[PDB]
A paper describes a structure:
Orthologs of LURE1 in Torenia concolor (TcCRP1)15 and A. thaliana (AtLURE1)9 were recently shown as key attractant molecules, indicating a significant role played by these secreted proteins in pollen tube guidance. By contrast, our data showed that the LRR-RK PRK6 expressed at the tip of pollen tube is an essential receptor of the same attractant peptide and important for targeting of pollen tube to ovule in the pistil. In the current study, we present biochemical, structural and functional evidence showing that AtPRK6 functioned as a receptor of AtLURE1, strongly supporting previous genetic data. Sharply contrasting with other LRR-RKs, AtPRK6 recognizes AtLURE1.2 through the C-terminal loop of its LRR domain rather than the LRR portion.
In order to probe the recognition mechanism of AtLURE1 peptides by AtPRK6 at atomic level, we solved the crystal structures of the AtLURE1.2-AtPRK6LRR complex crystallized in two different forms by molecular replacement. The AtLURE1.2-AtPRK6LRR protein complexes in the two crystal forms display a nearly identical structure. Two AtPRK6LRR molecules exist in one asymmetric unit of the crystal with higher resolution. Interestingly, one of the molecules is in an AtLURE1.2-free state. These structural observations suggest that the disulfide bond-stabilized C-terminal loop is likely important for AtPRK6 LRR interaction with AtLURE1.2 in vitro. The C-terminal loop of AtPRK6LRR is mainly responsible for its interaction with AtLURE1.2. Arg83 of AtLURE1.2 is located at the center of the AtLURE1.2-AtPRK6LRR interface by being sandwiched between the C-terminal loop and C-terminal extension of the last LRR of AtPRK6LRR, forming hydrogen bonds with the carboxyl oxygen atoms of Tyr227 and Cys237 of AtPRK6LRR. Additionally, this arginine residue tightly stacks against the disulfide bond formed between Cys229 and Cys237 of AtPRK6LRR.
Numbering used by the authors:
A (entry chain C): 14 to 50
B (entry chain B): 27 to 242
C (entry chain A): 27 to 239
The structure:
Amino acid sequence: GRIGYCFDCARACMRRGKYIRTCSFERKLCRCSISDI
Amino acid sequence: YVSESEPLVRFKNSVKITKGDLNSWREGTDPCSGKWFGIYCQKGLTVSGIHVTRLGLSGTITVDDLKDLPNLKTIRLDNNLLSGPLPHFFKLRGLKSLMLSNNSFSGEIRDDFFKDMSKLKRLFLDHNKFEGSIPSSITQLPQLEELHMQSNNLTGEIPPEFGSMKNLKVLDLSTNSLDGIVPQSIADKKNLAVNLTENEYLCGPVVDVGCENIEL
Amino acid sequence: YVSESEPLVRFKNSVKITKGDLNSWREGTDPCSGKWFGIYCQKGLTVSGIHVTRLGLSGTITVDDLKDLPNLKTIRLDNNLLSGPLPHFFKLRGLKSLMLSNNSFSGEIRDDFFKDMSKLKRLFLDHNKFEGSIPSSITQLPQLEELHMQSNNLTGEIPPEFGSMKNLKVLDLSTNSLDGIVPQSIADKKNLAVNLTENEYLCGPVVDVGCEN
């Protein structure tokens, strides 16, 4: 589902040291910030 | 001037006011006397601006009577109930400020809409229901200093030609569904206050969003 | 801007490049990247000028694609092989500088050609095959600073309005076929450099027609 997908997106951004910025489950889009946490 | 009362009374009689009135607009009197609601005059002599806000104006606006006011520079119709496509303000080629914030104007604005409005300095189209792409002629306005189009339903990419607008100091395109990549020309523009937030699929510098899709 | 590559590639394809190429002009790229040969841009952002010289440009050029460049101010096509009438550059109402020196443009220029070119400041029509009279619209160019029509085949009288011109600093009409009477209203000046040399039939007193072939 969408909530689990965007949880995994938030974790991916954290592993890159960024903030989650964009998450779309239906488009399978996950984008993080350029700035650092 | 007293002669300017005639086009203004016609304009009054062409609009539908649902919250208030324009009874102060009395034909055969000078609109610059101080007695006319929402009239601004240059040096108290000639009509230069019309500010008719919060009167529940409904339906559309036509400009065929406003064009008879030779010195009209400013039109403000904010906070009304107007609907339909953008009225033909491009027939007022001398206009310097157009403010239509917080109405229900709709539709995609014709790409060449603004071609004739060479004197426009301020353009407020925010809090409406405009759709489709930002019309390319907006970036060709030689004198434009402020563009507000926030809170609409715009889509598509932001034209990079905004970055070449010599006088542009305020650019608000927030709360739309603009997409693509923020033009570097806008990110690099000196002395620009720009707001591109709440455009979900827009990425790049100014929005602090990496374009890369992380596939996890 | 990438949107400006389309009309330039169309312009490139509309002329025949006999002696060189414009390989740098690549569709889908920004002509202000710093890589396009012969392109000027305003602040590295938008196309402002084209200067394509000594490429053996042959045939006729049309202005239907250059009109799509909103911020184009300067055109230089010197030292090429262009021919035919003077192209309809008056469509580019914002053009500030037009340089067509050393081509094979011909015919008589329409008198009212330059009426709409108000912003024009530099006009180089020298070293061509222009015929007929000097178009009087040139004399009513508001911002015109320099006019170079030398080494053509022009005829007729020099218009007196050249000496009432706002900002005109150079007027070179050398080596033509002008005649009539030298206006005193051009000899009076304010820092107007005038080269009327090699135009023999201009003498004010219409005397006996010596040296007549």
